Amino acid sequence: ILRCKCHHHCPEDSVNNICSTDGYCFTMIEEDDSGMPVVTSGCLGLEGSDFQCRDTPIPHQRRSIECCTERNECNKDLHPTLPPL
């Protein structure tokens, strides 16, 4: 039972910008159509995490995600970077 931060997108069965999970904390950076880095963070469950905790290149989108389990809120100290052109 791991606690994680969220700021962009964070669930209403969980106040104070903290979510709990059996999986992983994540931080993601994304280029919104604007093209400003928009970073988000939260909890990923155990099932599916092998596939979510790595990057898959999507056309017309720049995105990178990282995961962690080392400590509560370990995702505060994840700093994913966008894939270069």
Binding site: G23, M28, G48, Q52
Partner: protein
Amino acid sequence: ARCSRKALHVNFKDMGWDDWIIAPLEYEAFHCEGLCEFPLRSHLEPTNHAVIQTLMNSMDPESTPPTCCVPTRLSPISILFIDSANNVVYKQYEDMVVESCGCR
């Protein structure tokens, strides 16, 4: 708006069923609705499959639509009603109320 539980108010009288159903004539069923987008967060309890499909959709929206926001836990309600033999029956119906939503 991300995939989540929203209200669904069911009025049986509105359905014309006040002729067999005695009580209750209304109840809260809830529905799921909302986007299922990468990454599929823990509360959405995705399958391996939903994750793969979500990735595939966003890299080729022709191959497959995105995954769907649907109920993943449900609870029952009992209904008091008249049956075809004219017995009054009190029956637990399963899967009547959305308790949680997720991407499948």
